Each structure stands twice: as C-alpha cells, then as structure tokens.
Paper text:
To understand the structural basis for the specific recognition of PI(4,5)P2 by the DOCK8 DHR-1 domain, we performed X-ray crystallographic analysis, and determined its structure at 1.5-Å resolution. The crystal contained one protein molecule per asymmetric unit. The DOCK8 DHR-1 domain consists of a core structure adopting an anti-parallel β-sandwich with a C2 domain fold composed of a pair of four-stranded β-sheets, having a concave face called “β-groove” among C2 domains. The core is elaborated with two insertions between β2-β3, and β7-β8, and three loops (L1 through L3) that form a positively charged pocket on the upper surface. Notable distinction is found in the conformation of L1 to L3 loops and electrostatic surface potential of the upper surface pocket. In the DOCK8 DHR-1 domain, L1 and L2 loops mainly create the upper surface pocket, whereas all three loops participate in the pocket in the DOCK1 DHR-1 domain. In addition, the electrostatic surface potential of the upper surface pocket is less prominent in the DOCK8 DHR-1 domain.
Numbering used by the authors: 557 to 736
C-alpha cells in the first residue's frame, strides 16, 4: 500500500566522551520521541525493523563503527504527529558499565540524559547538534529548553564533562511517498 508521510530522521553520529576509561561501544543509548515529561509520554512512533511496519516507543543503539560495515549509518525514523508542539522532544538515555561494582558485577546502569526539543524559538530543530549529557536525572521542565542552556535548578543539574557537548546528531524532516 502506497502512503505519504512527513517523517523525522535522526542520525546518532558520534559519542565523544573524554574518559579514557570508557569507549563509545560500551555506552548504550535509548532513543524516544516524547510528547511530555512523564515516562508514559513516549510516543509509539519509531519505525521498527519488521515489515508492517511496527511502531516502537524506544530503540536502543551503541554508536560504534568497529563492528559495522564501512557503509553503515544508524537512522532513526519517526512518524511525526500531524500537529507538532513545543511539548514534543527527542529524549536520549545513556547507559554504561560502572567500574568496580559490588561483587564484581558488570551490568549496565544509568549514566544520564540528553534531549532536543523539536520546536524551539519558533523554529524546527533540524540540522547538526552537539549535545551535552545531564547526569543522574532530569529537572522538571527540562523539555522547554535546549540542553545547552537550562536555567539554574535547585537541586542543581550536574553535567558530564562540566557541560561540554559530547553527542553529535543530525536531524531532518522529510515528507515523501512510501510503498508500505
């Protein structure tokens, strides 16, 4: 069946932590398209791998190329809601393997978060972004701000690498015909 849709395409390109103790292959990233700040606000809008198509609330990825073909790129494809508002945002959750866990464990745990409002300052947020990572948790009302400039919070936000941008993505909206 032939359909026409306006889709958001998100390319998680590079993750560049300064830590010589970790590598990007060991950081997992969860990607969600949110309509609000509550955990229940993940929209079922991400194209899955299956035919159908299936729509997911989240995808997990690791930004590394050592185990990929040279032609590889990660492409997250999102069915935009017909009406996009300031409440819609990409939400990224980072997971890592903490060193020297109890009993020698080697499971993954929450590292932090980043996000990108899709509409900010009356402009669609397409193009290239280098995003910082907020550690531990997100403050209320995070999603109306760019992660690069959040008002002072109480308790205060802590950022990876003193608020340096570490996560490179590209974002574009494309409306086209799909032959589902």
């Amino acid at each position: 069946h032939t359909v026409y849709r306006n889709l958001l395409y998100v390319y998680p390109q590079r993750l560049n932590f300064a830590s010589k103790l970790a590598s990007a292959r060991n950081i997992t990233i969860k990607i969600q398209f949110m309509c609000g700040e509550d955990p229940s606000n993940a929209m079922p809008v991400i194209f899955g791998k299956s035919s159908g198509p299936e729509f997911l609330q989240e995808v997990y990825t690791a930004i590394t190329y050592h185990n990929k073909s040279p032609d590889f790129y990660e492409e997250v494809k999102i069915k935009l809601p017909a009406k996009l508002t300031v409440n819609h945002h990409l939400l990224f959750t980072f997971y890592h393997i903490s060193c020297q866990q109890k009993q020698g464990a080697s499971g993954e745990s929450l590292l932090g978060y980043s996000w990108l409002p899709i509409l900010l300052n009356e402009r669609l947020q397409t193009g290239s972004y280098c995003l910082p990572v907020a550690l531990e948790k997100l403050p209320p009302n995070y999603s109306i701000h760019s992660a690069e400039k959040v008002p002072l919070q109480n308790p205060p936000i802590k950022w990876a690498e003193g608020h340096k941008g570490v996560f490179n993505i590209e974002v574009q909206a494309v409306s086209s015909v799909h032959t589902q």
